[PDB]
Amino acid sequence: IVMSQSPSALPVSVGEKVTMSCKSSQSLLNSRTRKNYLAWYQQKPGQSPKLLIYWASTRESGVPDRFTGSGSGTDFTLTISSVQAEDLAVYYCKQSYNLWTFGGGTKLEIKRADAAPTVSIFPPSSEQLTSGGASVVCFLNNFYPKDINVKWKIDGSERQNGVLNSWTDQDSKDSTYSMSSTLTLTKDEYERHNSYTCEATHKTSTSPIVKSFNR
Amino acid sequence: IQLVQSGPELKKPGETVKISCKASGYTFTNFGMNWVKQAPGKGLKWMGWIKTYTGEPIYVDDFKGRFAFSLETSASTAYLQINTLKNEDTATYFCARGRPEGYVLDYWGQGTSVTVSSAKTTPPSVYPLAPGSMVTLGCLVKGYFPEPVTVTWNSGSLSSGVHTFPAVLQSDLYTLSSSVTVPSSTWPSETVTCNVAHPASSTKVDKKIVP
Ligand SMILES: O=c1[nH]cnc2c1ncn2[C@@H]1O[C@H](CO)[C@@H](O)[C@H]1O
């Protein structure tokens, strides 16, 4: 019994109406009790999940009125009539027809104007080189939407191994995303090449945003 | 009704861990106790439950063999025992009570973090990130264990234009980077320093960013 949620992320504006869907691979309706065994849970960062809706459409005590669940059989929906700041969370559907299985979750994010990444590239520090290591670091800061790709090139050739990547969550202040990418090699390897390039691909630019340093 | 779980766990591969979950405010044996796994950046995975009345446990296929649910009913405590740990076991584990009206997980514990690594406690190396209208600086905090490290800029005085990237665990050690953006007219004129702390190793490091 597989639970499938879409979209995986959902850009919203405060105050507007939001809808997210859950589909089951098999019907969740108990004919014997005309009961659809499908619940909705909210999980904000760092917190434990919280039950919002059960039996597909019954609101848990205390849960505000702007949350409604609907649907039946294999197609279900969670609606937030007017979205508040306090509602940005991950929402999970969970079936309890046959065992208790969660869907993959839909994350609410704040929409805003598209922003191209600011790309910075940093040579290794003198103090790291004295240790024998050498990390080249690329920051892709304050972009929107969240999808982005980064490519490293050394002396004009694409490099894939040694690359470590990290992604922030949406920033609470300007609603943008950021990415860090670290290329780790030895001092000797680093001193063999001359040109280090970090190239970003993002929907705000028809060409890659490239930044580099020599030597 | 409250469910309180035990504290975070650090383990090497192969060992066992036992997590507890103490329940209060309700008749313990009237409701099932459930365990849910959540890997760091992933979703929720129901693991199974145990009937508190009769003590029989039920495991989903992925959790058969190595995992043990147990109870001490007189103390209203449920236990999760994970034997032969792997790195894929690194996750937060929640206990949660099952309410039969709805068949839902209505009250949850706060979660217990388990990290599996062959690393021993290791202090980080901290390195400045210097370039080459606005200028972006950074610090690289590399090769430490366990989490957390904390990073501030100018002893906390620098607030906006700062963000810190989530640590990633690669080859049993963590690495993270911080970023600060300041007006190009203010650096290197006004000094910028990253303050890094690693409590597990009592490490405190202040690193000035120089051009
Ligand atoms: O806490 C619990 N966790 C999991 N299953 C439970 C719990 N309590 C009752 N049931 C079981 O859920 C079935 C319907 O999905 C019921 O038949 C019951 O045996």
Side-chain angles (χ1 to χ4, degrees), chain A residues 21-31 33 35-99:
Chain A
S21 99
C22 180
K23 278 161 231 145
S24 54
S25 63
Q26 141 181 355
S27 174
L28 308 186
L29 187 146
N30 215 12
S31 99
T33 57
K35 240 356 140 155
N36 291 274
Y37 287 100
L38 187 279
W40 288 95
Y41 299 81
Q42 177 195 59
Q43 187 186 29
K44 292 189 292 185
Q47 295 194 353
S48 299
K50 168 167 173 82
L51 176 69
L52 297 182
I53 296 310
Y54 58 100
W55 285 338
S57 37
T58 302
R59 273 195 221 71
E60 178 82 353
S61 200
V63 170
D65 273 85
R66 50 172 194 284
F67 289 100
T68 68
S70 60
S72 176
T74 55
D75 301 38
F76 304 84
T77 279
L78 184 60
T79 308
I80 316 195
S81 64
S82 168
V83 188
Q84 328 276 314
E86 88 218 65
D87 302 330
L88 294 305
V90 177
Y91 294 88
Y92 292 95
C93 64
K94 175 194 116 288
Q95 66 90 10
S96 41
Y97 194 61
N98 181 29
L99 313 171

Side-chain angles (χ1 to χ4, degrees), chain B residues 128-197:
Chain B
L129 298 170
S133 61
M134 255 177 240
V135 67
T136 292
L137 313 167
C139 287
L140 176 66
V141 177
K142 191 196 175 35
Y144 66 88
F145 190 86
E147 278 257 78
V149 292
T150 57
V151 187
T152 75
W153 289 93
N154 287 359
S155 305
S157 97
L158 213 30
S159 54
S160 38
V162 166
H163 53 266
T164 296
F165 297 91
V168 299
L169 181 66
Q170 183 65 260
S171 286
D172 289 345
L173 292 178
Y174 294 97
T175 292
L176 62 80
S177 56
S178 209
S179 157
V180 58
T181 293
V182 292
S184 181
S185 68
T186 299
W187 182 81
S189 171
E190 297 192 279
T191 63
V192 172
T193 309
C194 63
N195 322 102
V196 182

Side-chain angles (χ1 to χ4, degrees), chain A residues 96-97 99-100, chain B residues 32-34 46 49 51 97-99 103:
Chain A
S96 41
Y97 194 61
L99 313 171
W100 298 15
Chain B
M33 183 55 57
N34 295 260
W46 184 76
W49 65 302
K51 184 78 244 183
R97 167 190 103 145
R99 189 184 70 197
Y103 299 117

Side-chain angles (χ1 to χ4, degrees), chain B residues 42-63:
Chain B
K42 325 259 164 201
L44 303 165
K45 179 62 173 171
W46 184 76
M47 275 170 92
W49 65 302
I50 172 170
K51 184 78 244 183
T52 48
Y53 223 141
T54 78
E56 334 170 275
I58 295 179
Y59 306 93
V60 317
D61 282 349
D62 314 272
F63 292 107

Side-chain angles (χ1 to χ4, degrees), chain A residues 26-31 33 35-195:
Chain A
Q26 141 181 355
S27 174
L28 308 186
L29 187 146
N30 215 12
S31 99
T33 57
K35 240 356 140 155
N36 291 274
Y37 287 100
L38 187 279
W40 288 95
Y41 299 81
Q42 177 195 59
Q43 187 186 29
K44 292 189 292 185
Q47 295 194 353
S48 299
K50 168 167 173 82
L51 176 69
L52 297 182
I53 296 310
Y54 58 100
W55 285 338
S57 37
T58 302
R59 273 195 221 71
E60 178 82 353
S61 200
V63 170
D65 273 85
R66 50 172 194 284
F67 289 100
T68 68
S70 60
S72 176
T74 55
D75 301 38
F76 304 84
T77 279
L78 184 60
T79 308
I80 316 195
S81 64
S82 168
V83 188
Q84 328 276 314
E86 88 218 65
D87 302 330
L88 294 305
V90 177
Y91 294 88
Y92 292 95
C93 64
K94 175 194 116 288
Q95 66 90 10
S96 41
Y97 194 61
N98 181 29
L99 313 171
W100 298 15
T101 299
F102 284 105
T106 290
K107 182 180 310 213
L108 296 194
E109 70 152 35
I110 299 166
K111 53 219 203 196
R112 58 152 282 150
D114 285 350
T118 308
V119 182
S120 307
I121 193 183
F122 303 102
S125 68
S126 285
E127 293 177 350
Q128 191 184 4
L129 297 170
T130 303
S131 68
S135 301
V136 186
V137 177
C138 187
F139 293 162
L140 295 68
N141 286 338
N142 306 108
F143 55 90
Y144 188 93
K146 86 222 298 213
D147 320 288
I148 191 149
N149 282 303
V150 186
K151 243 197 276 212
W152 287 92
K153 297 209 266 244
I154 310 325
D155 282 345
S157 278
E158 310 158 296
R159 165 97 173 211
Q160 303 219 138
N161 64 34
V163 178
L164 212 32
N165 307 284
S166 180
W167 294 268
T168 65
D169 312 288
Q170 185 172 48
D171 169 83
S172 66
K173 295 350 280 163
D174 60 22
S175 301
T176 67
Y177 294 94
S178 298
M179 195 180 171
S180 189
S181 182
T182 297
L183 174 81
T184 291
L185 3 96
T186 74
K187 180 194 175 57
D188 289 345
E189 303 167 342
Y190 170 75
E191 298 292 357
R192 249 126 52 173
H193 311 269
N194 302 293
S195 150

Side-chain angles (χ1 to χ4, degrees), chain B residues 10 119-123 145-146 198 200-201:
Chain B
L10 300 173
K120 74 280 217 193
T121 301
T122 304
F145 190 86
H198 182 235
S201 65

Side-chain angles (χ1 to χ4, degrees), chain B residues 71-86:
Chain B
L71 308 166
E72 193 167 332
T73 51
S74 69
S76 296
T77 300
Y79 294 96
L80 179 50
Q81 155 103 329
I82 308 174
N83 305 295
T84 325
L85 284 154
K86 330 318 199 253

